[PDB]
Design a protein around this ligand. Structure first.
Ligand SMILES: *[C@@H]1O[C@H](CO)[C@@H](O[C@@H]2O[C@H](CO)[C@@H](O[C@@H]3O[C@H](CO)[C@@H](O)[C@H](O[C@H]4O[C@H](CO)[C@@H](O)[C@H](O)[C@@H]4O)[C@@H]3O[C@@H]3OC[C@@H](O)[C@H](O)[C@H]3O)[C@H](O)[C@H]2NC(C)=O)[C@H](O[C@@H]2O[C@@H](C)[C@@H](O)[C@@H](O)[C@@H]2O)[C@H]1NC(C)=O
Ligand SMILES: *[C@@H]1O[C@H](CO)[C@@H](O[C@H]2O[C@H](CO)[C@@H](O[C@@H]3O[C@H](CO)[C@@H](O)[C@H](O[C@@H]4O[C@H](CO)[C@@H](O)[C@H](O)[C@@H]4O)[C@@H]3O[C@@H]3OC[C@@H](O)[C@H](O)[C@H]3O)[C@H](O)[C@H]2NC(C)=O)[C@H](O[C@H]2O[C@@H](C)[C@@H](O)[C@@H](O)[C@@H]2O)[C@H]1NC(C)=O
Ligand SMILES: *[C@@H]1O[C@H](CO)[C@@H](O[C@@H]2O[C@H](CO)[C@@H](OC3O[C@H](CO)[C@@H](O)[C@H](O)[C@@H]3O)[C@H](O)[C@H]2NC(C)=O)[C@H](O[C@@H]2O[C@@H](C)[C@@H](O)[C@@H](O)[C@@H]2O)[C@H]1NC(C)=O
Ligand SMILES: *[C@@H]1O[C@H](CO)[C@@H](O[C@@H]2O[C@H](CO)[C@@H](O[C@H]3O[C@H](CO)[C@@H](O)[C@H](O)[C@@H]3O)[C@H](O)[C@H]2NC(C)=O)[C@H](O[C@@H]2O[C@@H](C)[C@@H](O)[C@@H](O)[C@@H]2O)[C@H]1NC(C)=O
Ligand SMILES: *[C@@H]1O[C@H](CO)[C@@H](O[C@@H]2O[C@H](CO)[C@@H](O[C@H]3O[C@H](CO)[C@@H](O)[C@H](O)[C@@H]3O)[C@H](O)[C@H]2NC(C)=O)[C@H](O[C@H]2O[C@@H](C)[C@@H](O)[C@@H](O)[C@@H]2O)[C@H]1NC(C)=O
Ligand code: HEM
Ligand SMILES: *[C@@H]1O[C@H](CO)[C@@H](O[C@@H]2O[C@H](CO)[C@@H](O)[C@H](O)[C@H]2NC(C)=O)[C@H](O)[C@H]1NC(C)=O
Ligand SMILES: CC(=O)N[C@@H]1[C@@H](O)[C@H](O)[C@@H](CO)O[C@H]1O
Ligand SMILES: [Ca+2]
Ligand SMILES: [Ca+2]
Length: 307
């Protein structure tokens, strides 16, 4: 419905700088926050479009996406999002959508982490509903395999190029034992660890995530540069060092078109950065609410009139 770069030009011209300022503050105490923030945009877009559905808390009317499988005890940064919103509301009351906040924060997070900048498209509007069931089914799982994951991307209009570049977001941030422990001991019922997992990594992960353990351990998505936004994620894959089954599958899946793309990104960081920016824009374009559909939420946690 034609999101555009200049949507707030009249009404909140400095929105981008303001978001960036808050995200930078946030980074001061939490190295992980930029990663968590971009993930929220991803999880937002993949369920009923980039409509801030994910942000909504439980109520009598709302069964929160926060409780969905991919989100529960995993998704994070909601308080920081509130802090960004509070700044915007103070400068430009009633203007900037939560859906837009997520898009803007994503760019700030990458740029602040040494990554590329891109021109965020704006004009999204905030949903009055959540779709927990959609979150359970629409969002890719790390263990469902590349074909299913690729279908899930297609399903929202994102192609293989998009999939590989976007997977590059795993260049920063963290993962809990449970999302990758299937690799560790009895992979795919084989009785052995995933052979595509670098044995050096395997050994440390095994210690981190003991087989009859509680699963509290957490580690870096990118063992090379856990916080910098760079192409090391791709180089890692070349060395069997991708963390998630879904990560490594991009390189190790015999005959996958993904392999050449990863190699290309591994060779040329600039190329990866350019592709990542375009892909972020593409993801950001998924099924927006626009015009007078939806609302501008005053508090991202709640529909207007609920708090
Ligand atoms: C990026 O996306 C933005 C959102 O779509 C664009 O801005 C919107 O642009 C429209 C105009 O096309 C703005 O609409 C108006 O809103 C005011 C009230 O707030 C109305 O009074 C006004 O209506 C009168 O003018 C009409 C002519 O346009 C008459 O036909 C009408 O009878 C009235 O006399 C008008 O309301 C629009 O009228 C036409 C309808 O088709 C339309 O449904 C109705 O909304 C709108 O306010 C604005 N939204 C925001 C948040 O700014 C944006 O467009 C550019 O920037 C704006 C500010 C305008 O200057 C546009 O002319 C300009 O193209 C766009 N930017 C780019 C580069 O694409
Ligand atoms: C790594 O993961 C693998 C997957 O879990 C696992 O593999 C095997 O898993 C199970 C073993 O528990 C195998 O299933 C069994 O198959 C035989 C014969 O086909 C059945 O006789 C078994 O029945 C059992 O027998 C009684 C009846 O007499 C059952 O009532 C009872 O449930 C009992 O479990 C059993 O059958 C299953 O029974 C329950 C049904 O709901 C299932 O549909 C049915 O399959 C399975 O054949 C085998 N799969 C594969 C791909 O190999 C690995 O376990 C191995 O180590 C041991 C635990 C031992 O089970 C070995 O046989 C396995 O090879 C596991 N490997 C490691 C090291 O952890
Ligand atoms: C979407 O996925 C989430 C996460 O799996 C569903 O929520 C979870 O559902 C389970 C079981 O229905 C709850 O669990 C218990 O865990 C045991 C299962 O191994 C049960 O035997 C035992 O009864 C426990 O009470 C989880 O607590 C729950 N997890 C979270 C974070 O909320 C979710 O399911 C929805 O919510 C449930 C509470 C049920 O009401 C479901 O009917 C309901 O569908 C999934 N949501 C949708 C729309 O599919
Ligand atoms: C590493 O990746 C970067 C980015 O993808 C490559 O540089 C880009 O190369 C493209 C060409 O494929 C180049 O393309 C456009 O811009 C032109 C106008 O400026 C336009 O006329 C043209 O139609 C294209 O749309 C693009 O500008 C450029 N991006 C940047 C930021 O420089 C890079 O390419 C190598 O260097 C470029 C300049 C070109 O000479 C290529 O032929 C080279 O391959 C990649 N390096 C390597 C070794 O592959
Ligand atoms: C298991 O993980 C190991 C550690 O990451 C990995 O070894 C390392 O592989 C890299 C890549 O070749 C080596 O790096 C040099 O060269 C490139 C130049 O482009 C640089 O980017 C690097 O920074 C570095 O200069 C690195 O030295 C190497 N470390 C050790 C101790 O060997 C293992 O890779 C082995 O298998 C291949 C990937 C191949 O590269 C081997 O040479 C390498 O030893 C990795 N094991 C497996 C099976 O993937
Ligand atoms: C391609 C399919 C994808 C799968 C299977 C996947 C799965 C996962 C999993 C399992 C985690 C760890 C969750 C946890 O341990 O709590 C995670 C974290 C993360 N995801 Fe992905 N994801 C995918 C795509 C994406 C995309 C498209 C983006 C952004 C553009 C993204 C950004 C992130 C970030 C930054 C983290 C770390 C978050 C943090 O530290 O808070 N992922 N993802
Ligand atoms: C646009 O936004 C930026 C950031 O919020 C504004 O600049 C900051 O202004 C404060 C207040 O004096 C300073 O403490 C910061 O050091 C500044 N940060 C940066 C990155 O510049 C800026 O003034 C805003 N411009 C307008 C017209 O409102
Ligand atoms: C790789 C493949 O063939 N299938 C996977 C697997 O998770 C399952 O078959 C299906 C279930 O929904 O999702 C996909
Ligand atoms: Ca959504
Ligand atoms: Ca990195």
């Amino acid at each position: 419905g034609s999101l555009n770069a200049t949507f707030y030009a009249g009404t909140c011209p400095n929105a981008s700088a303001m978001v960036r300022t808050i995200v930078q503050q946030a980074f001061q105490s939490d190295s992980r926050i930029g990663a968590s923030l971009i993930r929220l945009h991803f999880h937002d877009c993949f369920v009923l479009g980039c409509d801030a559905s994910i942000l909504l808390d439980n109520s009598g009317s709302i069964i929160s996406e926060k409780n969905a499988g991919p989100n529960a005890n995993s998704a994070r940064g909601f308080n920081v999002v509130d802090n960004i919103k509070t700044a915007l509301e103070n400068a430009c009351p009633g203007v900037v959508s939560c859906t837009d906040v997520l898009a803007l924060a994503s760019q700030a997070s990458v740029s602040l982490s040494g990554g590329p900048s891109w021109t965020v498209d704006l004009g999204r509007r905030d949903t009055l509903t959540a779709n927990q069931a959609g979150a359970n089914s629409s969002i890719p799982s790390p263990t469902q395999g590349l074909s299913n994951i690729t279908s899930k991307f297609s399903a929202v209009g994102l192609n293989t190029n998009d999939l590989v570049a976007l997977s590059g977001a795993h260049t920063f941030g963290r993962a809990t034992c449970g999302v990758f422990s299937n690799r560790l001991f009895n992979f795919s019922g084989k009785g052995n660890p995933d052979p595509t997992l670098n044995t050096t990594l395997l050994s440390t992960l095994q210690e981190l995530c003991p087989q009859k353990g509680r699963g509290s351990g957490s580690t870096n998505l990118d063992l090379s540069t856990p916080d910098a936004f760079d192409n090391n994620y791709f180089t890692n894959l070349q060395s069997n060092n991708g963390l998630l089954q879904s990560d490594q599958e991009l390189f190790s899946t015999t005959g996958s078109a993904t392999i050449a793309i990863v190699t290309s990104f591994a060779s040329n960081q600039t190329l990866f950065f350019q592709a990542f920016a375009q892909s972020m824009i593409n993801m950001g374009n998924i099924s927006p609410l626009t015009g007078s559909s939806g609302e501008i939420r005053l508090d991202c946690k709640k529909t207007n009139g609920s708090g």
